PDB file of all heavy atoms in Angstrom:
ATOM      1  N   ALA A  25      61.908 -43.101 -42.826  1.00 29.15           N
ATOM      2  CA  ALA A  25      60.931 -42.272 -42.135  1.00 29.15           C
ATOM      3  C   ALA A  25      60.236 -43.106 -41.119  1.00 29.15           C
ATOM      4  O   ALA A  25      59.939 -44.295 -41.311  1.00 29.15           O
ATOM      5  CB  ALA A  25      59.935 -41.699 -43.130  1.00 29.15           C
ATOM      6  N   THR A  26      60.036 -42.534 -39.916  1.00 30.53           N
ATOM      7  CA  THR A  26      59.462 -43.241 -38.846  1.00 30.53           C
ATOM      8  C   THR A  26      58.586 -42.336 -38.002  1.00 30.53           C
ATOM      9  O   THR A  26      58.776 -41.141 -37.931  1.00 30.53           O
ATOM     10  CB  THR A  26      60.589 -43.843 -37.905  1.00 30.53           C
ATOM     11  OG1 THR A  26      60.028 -44.601 -36.857  1.00 30.53           O
ATOM     12  CG2 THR A  26      61.473 -42.752 -37.378  1.00 30.53           C
ATOM     13  N   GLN A  27      57.568 -42.949 -37.391  1.00 32.10           N
ATOM     14  CA  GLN A  27      56.699 -42.203 -36.504  1.00 32.10           C
ATOM     15  C   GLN A  27      57.394 -42.084 -35.112  1.00 32.10           C
ATOM     16  O   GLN A  27      57.878 -43.048 -34.525  1.00 32.10           O
ATOM     17  CB  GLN A  27      55.363 -42.897 -36.277  1.00 32.10           C
ATOM     18  CG  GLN A  27      54.384 -42.074 -35.469  1.00 32.10           C
ATOM     19  CD  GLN A  27      52.962 -42.467 -35.699  1.00 32.10           C
ATOM     20  OE1 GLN A  27      52.652 -43.377 -36.425  1.00 32.10           O
ATOM     21  NE2 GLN A  27      52.067 -41.717 -35.088  1.00 32.10           N
ATOM     22  N   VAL A  28      57.462 -40.851 -34.620  1.00 31.36           N
ATOM     23  CA  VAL A  28      58.024 -40.529 -33.319  1.00 31.36           C
ATOM     24  C   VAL A  28      56.924 -40.038 -32.387  1.00 31.36           C
ATOM     25  O   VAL A  28      56.698 -40.560 -31.325  1.00 31.36           O
ATOM     26  CB  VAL A  28      59.200 -39.529 -33.438  1.00 31.36           C
ATOM     27  CG1 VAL A  28      59.549 -38.965 -32.057  1.00 31.36           C
ATOM     28  CG2 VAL A  28      60.399 -40.250 -34.018  1.00 31.36           C
ATOM     29  N   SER A  29      56.320 -38.877 -32.761  1.00 29.63           N
ATOM     30  CA  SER A  29      55.311 -38.299 -31.928  1.00 29.63           C
ATOM     31  C   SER A  29      53.953 -38.864 -32.175  1.00 29.63           C
ATOM     32  O   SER A  29      53.410 -38.653 -33.291  1.00 29.63           O
ATOM     33  CB  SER A  29      55.290 -36.791 -32.090  1.00 29.63           C
ATOM     34  OG  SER A  29      54.918 -36.406 -33.442  1.00 29.63           O
ATOM     35  N   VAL A  30      53.383 -39.568 -31.214  1.00 30.33           N
ATOM     36  CA  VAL A  30      52.093 -40.197 -31.388  1.00 30.33           C
ATOM     37  C   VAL A  30      50.940 -39.292 -30.851  1.00 30.33           C
ATOM     38  O   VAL A  30      49.791 -39.393 -31.267  1.00 30.33           O
ATOM     39  CB  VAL A  30      51.991 -41.582 -30.736  1.00 30.33           C
ATOM     40  CG1 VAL A  30      50.840 -42.355 -31.285  1.00 30.33           C
ATOM     41  CG2 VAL A  30      53.293 -42.326 -30.985  1.00 30.33           C
ATOM     42  N   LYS A  31      51.276 -38.396 -29.933  1.00 28.61           N
ATOM     43  CA  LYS A  31      50.286 -37.506 -29.357  1.00 28.61           C
ATOM     44  C   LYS A  31      49.610 -36.846 -30.535  1.00 28.61           C
ATOM     45  O   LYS A  31      48.382 -36.783 -30.585  1.00 28.61           O
ATOM     46  CB  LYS A  31      50.916 -36.491 -28.397  1.00 28.61           C
ATOM     47  N   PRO A  32      50.379 -36.257 -31.458  1.00 27.93           N
ATOM     48  CA  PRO A  32      49.771 -35.707 -32.676  1.00 27.93           C
ATOM     49  C   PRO A  32      50.452 -36.402 -33.861  1.00 27.93           C
ATOM     50  O   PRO A  32      51.731 -36.472 -33.894  1.00 27.93           O
ATOM     51  CB  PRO A  32      50.160 -34.248 -32.629  1.00 27.93           C
ATOM     52  CG  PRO A  32      51.435 -34.241 -31.836  1.00 27.93           C
ATOM     53  CD  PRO A  32      51.665 -35.577 -31.167  1.00 27.93           C
ATOM     54  N   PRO A  33      49.718 -36.918 -34.835  1.00 26.84           N
ATOM     55  CA  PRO A  33      50.396 -37.650 -35.897  1.00 26.84           C
ATOM     56  C   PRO A  33      51.657 -36.893 -36.396  1.00 26.84           C
ATOM     57  O   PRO A  33      51.502 -35.817 -37.012  1.00 26.84           O
ATOM     58  CB  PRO A  33      49.354 -37.676 -37.006  1.00 26.84           C
ATOM     59  CG  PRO A  33      48.057 -37.722 -36.284  1.00 26.84           C
ATOM     60  CD  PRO A  33      48.254 -36.912 -35.044  1.00 26.84           C
ATOM     61  N   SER A  34      52.818 -37.427 -36.092  1.00 29.50           N
ATOM     62  CA  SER A  34      54.063 -36.760 -36.516  1.00 29.50           C
ATOM     63  C   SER A  34      55.175 -37.758 -36.849  1.00 29.50           C
ATOM     64  O   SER A  34      55.241 -38.827 -36.218  1.00 29.50           O
ATOM     65  CB  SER A  34      54.517 -35.799 -35.409  1.00 29.50           C
ATOM     66  OG  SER A  34      53.597 -34.755 -35.226  1.00 29.50           O
ATOM     67  N   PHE A  35      56.015 -37.422 -37.804  1.00 28.70           N
ATOM     68  CA  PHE A  35      57.102 -38.286 -38.240  1.00 28.70           C
ATOM     69  C   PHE A  35      58.323 -37.575 -38.627  1.00 28.70           C
ATOM     70  O   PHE A  35      58.367 -36.354 -38.631  1.00 28.70           O
ATOM     71  CB  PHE A  35      56.597 -39.188 -39.371  1.00 28.70           C
ATOM     72  CG  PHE A  35      55.115 -39.478 -39.338  1.00 28.70           C
ATOM     73  CD1 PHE A  35      54.202 -38.589 -39.946  1.00 28.70           C
ATOM     74  CD2 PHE A  35      54.642 -40.622 -38.740  1.00 28.70           C
ATOM     75  CE1 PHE A  35      52.872 -38.867 -39.905  1.00 28.70           C
ATOM     76  CE2 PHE A  35      53.278 -40.872 -38.685  1.00 28.70           C
ATOM     77  CZ  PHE A  35      52.390 -40.032 -39.288  1.00 28.70           C
ATOM     78  N   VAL A  36      59.359 -38.291 -39.014  1.00 29.68           N
ATOM     79  CA  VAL A  36      60.669 -37.638 -39.406  1.00 29.68           C
ATOM     80  C   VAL A  36      61.363 -38.448 -40.526  1.00 29.68           C
ATOM     81  O   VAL A  36      61.370 -39.644 -40.513  1.00 29.68           O
ATOM     82  CB  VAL A  36      61.601 -37.450 -38.168  1.00 29.68           C
ATOM     83  CG1 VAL A  36      61.956 -38.791 -37.567  1.00 29.68           C
ATOM     84  CG2 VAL A  36      62.813 -36.680 -38.634  1.00 29.68           C
ATOM     85  N   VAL A  37      61.811 -37.654 -41.486  1.00 25.70           N
ATOM     86  CA  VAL A  37      62.401 -38.304 -42.630  1.00 25.70           C
ATOM     87  C   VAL A  37      63.912 -38.153 -42.705  1.00 25.70           C
ATOM     88  O   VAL A  37      64.393 -37.033 -42.502  1.00 25.70           O
ATOM     89  CB  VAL A  37      61.677 -37.842 -43.885  1.00 25.70           C
ATOM     90  CG1 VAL A  37      61.801 -36.333 -44.024  1.00 25.70           C
ATOM     91  CG2 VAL A  37      62.241 -38.521 -45.103  1.00 25.70           C
ATOM     92  N   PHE A  38      64.647 -39.175 -42.981  1.00 27.46           N
ATOM     93  CA  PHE A  38      66.082 -39.175 -43.004  1.00 27.46           C
ATOM     94  C   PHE A  38      66.499 -39.019 -44.478  1.00 27.46           C
ATOM     95  O   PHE A  38      66.496 -39.937 -45.259  1.00 27.46           O
ATOM     96  CB  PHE A  38      66.742 -40.442 -42.474  1.00 27.46           C
ATOM     97  CG  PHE A  38      66.822 -40.506 -40.990  1.00 27.46           C
ATOM     98  CD1 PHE A  38      65.678 -40.367 -40.184  1.00 27.46           C
ATOM     99  CD2 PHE A  38      68.040 -40.644 -40.329  1.00 27.46           C
ATOM    100  CE1 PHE A  38      65.762 -40.404 -38.829  1.00 27.46           C
ATOM    101  CE2 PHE A  38      68.123 -40.677 -38.941  1.00 27.46           C
ATOM    102  CZ  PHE A  38      66.989 -40.521 -38.219  1.00 27.46           C
ATOM    103  N   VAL A  39      66.887 -37.786 -44.817  1.00 30.34           N
ATOM    104  CA  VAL A  39      67.267 -37.526 -46.187  1.00 30.34           C
ATOM    105  C   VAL A  39      68.716 -37.084 -46.342  1.00 30.34           C
ATOM    106  O   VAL A  39      69.406 -36.920 -45.333  1.00 30.34           O
ATOM    107  CB  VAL A  39      66.374 -36.382 -46.836  1.00 30.34           C
ATOM    108  CG1 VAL A  39      64.920 -36.808 -46.784  1.00 30.34           C
ATOM    109  CG2 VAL A  39      66.583 -35.112 -46.083  1.00 30.34           C
ATOM    110  N   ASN A  40      69.192 -36.831 -47.579  1.00 32.56           N
ATOM    111  CA  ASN A  40      70.553 -36.439 -47.774  1.00 32.56           C
ATOM    112  C   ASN A  40      70.774 -34.945 -47.546  1.00 32.56           C
ATOM    113  O   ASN A  40      71.606 -34.569 -46.780  1.00 32.56           O
ATOM    114  CB  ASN A  40      71.014 -36.885 -49.165  1.00 32.56           C
ATOM    115  CG  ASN A  40      72.252 -36.109 -49.651  1.00 32.56           C
ATOM    116  OD1 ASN A  40      73.243 -36.055 -48.906  1.00 32.56           O
ATOM    117  ND2 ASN A  40      72.227 -35.554 -50.844  1.00 32.56           N
ATOM    118  N   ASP A  41      70.008 -34.133 -48.274  1.00 34.24           N
ATOM    119  CA  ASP A  41      70.150 -32.707 -48.165  1.00 34.24           C
ATOM    120  C   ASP A  41      68.916 -31.976 -47.574  1.00 34.24           C
ATOM    121  O   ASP A  41      67.910 -31.841 -48.295  1.00 34.24           O
ATOM    122  CB  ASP A  41      70.398 -32.250 -49.629  1.00 34.24           C
ATOM    123  CG  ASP A  41      71.708 -32.660 -50.134  1.00 34.24           C
ATOM    124  OD1 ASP A  41      72.571 -33.071 -49.313  1.00 34.24           O
ATOM    125  OD2 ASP A  41      71.924 -32.589 -51.363  1.00 34.24           O
ATOM    126  N   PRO A  42      68.926 -31.514 -46.358  1.00 36.37           N
ATOM    127  CA  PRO A  42      67.783 -30.877 -45.784  1.00 36.37           C
ATOM    128  C   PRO A  42      67.410 -29.579 -46.545  1.00 36.37           C
ATOM    129  O   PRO A  42      66.237 -29.231 -46.534  1.00 36.37           O
ATOM    130  CB  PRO A  42      68.217 -30.545 -44.338  1.00 36.37           C
ATOM    131  CG  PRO A  42      69.725 -30.547 -44.391  1.00 36.37           C
ATOM    132  CD  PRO A  42      70.089 -31.579 -45.413  1.00 36.37           C
ATOM    133  N   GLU A  43      68.372 -28.919 -47.174  1.00 35.50           N
ATOM    134  CA  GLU A  43      68.013 -27.711 -47.891  1.00 35.50           C
ATOM    135  C   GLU A  43      67.396 -27.994 -49.238  1.00 35.50           C
ATOM    136  O   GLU A  43      66.565 -27.216 -49.719  1.00 35.50           O
ATOM    137  CB  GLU A  43      69.285 -26.851 -48.043  1.00 35.50           C
ATOM    138  CG  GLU A  43      70.384 -27.354 -49.006  1.00 35.50           C
ATOM    139  CD  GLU A  43      70.027 -27.138 -50.488  1.00 35.50           C
ATOM    140  OE1 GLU A  43      69.192 -26.261 -50.748  1.00 35.50           O
ATOM    141  OE2 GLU A  43      70.581 -27.802 -51.357  1.00 35.50           O
ATOM    142  N   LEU A  44      67.749 -29.096 -49.879  1.00 32.59           N
ATOM    143  CA  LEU A  44      67.403 -29.360 -51.260  1.00 32.59           C
ATOM    144  C   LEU A  44      65.903 -29.518 -51.507  1.00 32.59           C
ATOM    145  O   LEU A  44      65.428 -29.446 -52.658  1.00 32.59           O
ATOM    146  CB  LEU A  44      68.130 -30.621 -51.734  1.00 32.59           C
ATOM    147  CG  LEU A  44      68.451 -30.669 -53.262  1.00 32.59           C
ATOM    148  CD1 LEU A  44      68.879 -29.331 -53.788  1.00 32.59           C
ATOM    149  CD2 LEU A  44      69.529 -31.725 -53.504  1.00 32.59           C
ATOM    150  N   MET A  45      65.098 -29.658 -50.455  1.00 33.35           N
ATOM    151  CA  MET A  45      63.677 -29.953 -50.589  1.00 33.35           C
ATOM    152  C   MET A  45      62.929 -28.743 -51.194  1.00 33.35           C
ATOM    153  O   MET A  45      63.493 -27.646 -51.396  1.00 33.35           O
ATOM    154  CB  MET A  45      63.079 -30.370 -49.266  1.00 33.35           C
ATOM    155  CG  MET A  45      63.538 -29.610 -48.012  1.00 33.35           C
ATOM    156  SD  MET A  45      63.806 -27.787 -48.164  1.00 33.35           S
ATOM    157  CE  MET A  45      62.147 -27.197 -48.450  1.00 33.35           C
ATOM    158  N   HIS A  46      61.679 -28.960 -51.473  1.00 32.39           N
ATOM    159  CA  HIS A  46      60.789 -27.927 -51.902  1.00 32.39           C
ATOM    160  C   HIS A  46      59.433 -28.128 -51.216  1.00 32.39           C
ATOM    161  O   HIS A  46      58.949 -29.265 -51.153  1.00 32.39           O
ATOM    162  CB  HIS A  46      60.595 -27.997 -53.406  1.00 32.39           C
ATOM    163  CG  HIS A  46      59.818 -26.836 -53.988  1.00 32.39           C
ATOM    164  ND1 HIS A  46      58.600 -26.485 -53.582  1.00 32.39           N
ATOM    165  CD2 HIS A  46      60.183 -25.946 -54.961  1.00 32.39           C
ATOM    166  CE1 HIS A  46      58.153 -25.456 -54.233  1.00 32.39           C
ATOM    167  NE2 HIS A  46      59.112 -25.088 -55.100  1.00 32.39           N
ATOM    168  N   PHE A  47      58.832 -27.095 -50.718  1.00 29.45           N
ATOM    169  CA  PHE A  47      57.661 -27.184 -49.865  1.00 29.45           C
ATOM    170  C   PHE A  47      56.546 -27.905 -50.602  1.00 29.45           C
ATOM    171  O   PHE A  47      55.731 -28.565 -49.956  1.00 29.45           O
ATOM    172  CB  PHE A  47      57.189 -25.776 -49.441  1.00 29.45           C
ATOM    173  CG  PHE A  47      56.967 -24.834 -50.552  1.00 29.45           C
ATOM    174  CD1 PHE A  47      55.794 -24.838 -51.308  1.00 29.45           C
ATOM    175  CD2 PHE A  47      57.931 -23.907 -50.914  1.00 29.45           C
ATOM    176  CE1 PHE A  47      55.617 -23.975 -52.302  1.00 29.45           C
ATOM    177  CE2 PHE A  47      57.751 -23.020 -51.924  1.00 29.45           C
ATOM    178  CZ  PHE A  47      56.573 -23.053 -52.647  1.00 29.45           C
ATOM    179  N   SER A  48      56.546 -27.755 -51.922  1.00 28.33           N
ATOM    180  CA  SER A  48      55.494 -28.535 -52.715  1.00 28.33           C
ATOM    181  C   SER A  48      55.759 -30.042 -52.578  1.00 28.33           C
ATOM    182  O   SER A  48      54.815 -30.809 -52.444  1.00 28.33           O
ATOM    183  CB  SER A  48      55.553 -28.130 -54.157  1.00 28.33           C
ATOM    184  OG  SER A  48      54.607 -28.793 -54.956  1.00 28.33           O
TER     185      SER A  48
END
């Protein structure tokens, strides 16, 4: 996971399955 957008605190996570997540 890394910070990309600094204008508004924002980041991106490199995971295996984008669908497998849960909003919780």
